[PDB]
Amino acid sequence: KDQEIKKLVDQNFKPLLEKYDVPGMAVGVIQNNKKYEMYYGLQSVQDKKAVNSNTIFELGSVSKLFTATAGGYAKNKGKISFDDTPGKYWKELKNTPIDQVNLLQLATYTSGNLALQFPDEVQTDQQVLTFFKDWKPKNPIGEYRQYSNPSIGLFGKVVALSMNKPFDQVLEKTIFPALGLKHSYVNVPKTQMQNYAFGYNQENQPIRVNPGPLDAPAYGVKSTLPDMLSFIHANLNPQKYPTDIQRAINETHQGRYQVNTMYQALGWEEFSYPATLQTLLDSNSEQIVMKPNKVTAISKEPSVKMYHKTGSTSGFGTYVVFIPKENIGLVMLTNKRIPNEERIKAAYVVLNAIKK
Numbered sequence: 122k123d124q125e126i127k128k129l130v131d132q133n134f135k136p137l138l139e140k141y142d143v144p145g146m147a148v149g150v151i152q153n154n155k156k157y158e159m160y161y162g163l164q165s166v167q168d169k170k171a172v173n174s175n176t177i178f179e180l181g182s183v184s185k186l187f188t189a190t191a192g193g194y195a196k197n198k199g200k201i202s203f204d205d206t207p208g209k210y211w212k213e214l215k216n217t218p219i220d221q222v223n224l225l226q227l228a229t230y231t232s233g234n235l236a237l238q239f240p241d242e243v244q245t246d247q248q249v250l251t252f253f254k255d256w257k258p259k260n261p262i263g264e265y266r267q268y269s270n271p272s273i274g275l276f277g278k279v280v281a282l283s284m285n286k287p288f289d290q291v292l293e294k295t296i297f298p299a300l301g302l303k304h305s306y307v308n309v310p311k312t313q314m315q316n317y318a319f320g321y322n323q324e325n326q327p328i329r330v331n332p333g334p335l336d337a338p339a340y341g342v343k344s345t346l347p348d349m350l351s352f353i354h355a356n357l358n359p360q361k362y363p364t365d366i367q368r369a370i371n372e373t374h375q376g377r378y379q380v381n382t383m384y385q386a387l388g389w390e391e392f393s394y395p396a397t398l399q400t401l402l403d404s405n406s407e408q409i410v411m412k413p414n415k416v417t418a419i420s421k422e423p424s425v426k427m428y429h430k431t432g433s434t435s436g437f438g439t440y441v442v443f444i445p446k447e448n449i450g451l452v453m454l455t456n457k458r459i460p461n462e463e464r465i466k467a468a469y470v471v472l473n474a475i476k477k
């Protein structure tokens with residue numbers, strides 16, 4: 122049975138490399154605390170350098186899961202309340218319209234007036250402060266979900282303020298060590314640049330993510346397959362980890378509201394398990410990702426849950442999924458974007474063929 126995992130990943134993931142002309146891929150499965158690492162192709166086309174357990178990939182929006190974990194850690198240490206507003210920590214936002222939005226609404230994209238991205242012109246800290254000072258509501262606060270880098274970005278900045286550390290240090294000095302991650306970075310050091318994969322755009326030109334406003338909390342983390350399998354292990358089996366990070370992890374698993382079949386947790390998307398393929402595909406549909414959607418209160422609190430998150434930068438694709446009840450999870454890292462649908466479907470076939 123264990124011998125089948127490589128064959129399943131070869132059957133379902135390997136063909137995507139030829140299909141989308143992806144230079145390199147790392148696919149990890151964790152089942153009953155056993156890790157399986159499958160490596161394909163090249164971390165660098167020009168250097169002919171093979172993807173391996175040292176290869177560092179851009180996580181894109183999977184970074185939001187670390188931001189969520191940092192938030193849960195700060196909350197359970199009493200450094201913040203999710204009922205708090207940003208002005209309590211970022212003084213220059215005190216008594217401004219954005220100061221009517223609480224930390225949970227920022228983390229779960231329900232300010233009612235924040236788009237996917239900051240405007241291109243917003244780059245400096247001053248321009249970012251100005252943007253939030255000038256912010257005014259549109260939809261009723263807490264009622265509409267619009268997936269937003271600025272929204273969880275501001276949440277990340279406030280978490281960092283609450284811990285009196287820059288956000289990069291919150292992750293690199295507190296959260297990553299607590300999760301036992303050896304090669305996870307906001308800023309990849311000189312000594313690890315040799316292990317940092319090139320991303321490849323739709324013209325197969327090498328690219329890396331550029332600095333941007335509140336980039337670190339929104340899409341700014343880089344990691345290896347082993348590290349991301351450790352992170353999934355922590356989400357499946359927190360008991361081996363410190364109480365503080367156990368509490369932080371449990372906080373990220375709590376559904377806050379529904380958009381039909383999708384439950385918004387902290388960073389994580391949550392579903393009733395078993396979930397149909399189309400439920401998981403629907404979670405990252407144009408309608409859900411790009412448009413505002415009126416939320417409902419959770420009506421059906423699922424007994425048995427699964428969680429996933431996609432991530433993209435210009436050069437990298439990420440997908441992470443775990444199912445506590447089956448004690449299984451999967452990580453996919455590519456140094457070229459492939460459609461979300463392909464990531465979700467490949468993972469669905471593999472996880473459904475192992476478990477039973």
Ligand SMILES: *[B@]([O])([C][N]C(=O)/C(=N\OC([C])([C])C([O])=O)C1=[C]SC([N])=N1)OP([O])([O])=O
Nearest residue numbers: 181182183270330340410431432433434435
């Ligand atoms: B996350 O990753 C977010 N994302 C972002 O931001 C981006 N983009 O976006 C889109 C288009 C939507 C995609 O998908 O990709 C970017 C690019 S470059 C950078 N830095 N960033 O989440 P998702 O949804 O993506 O998964």
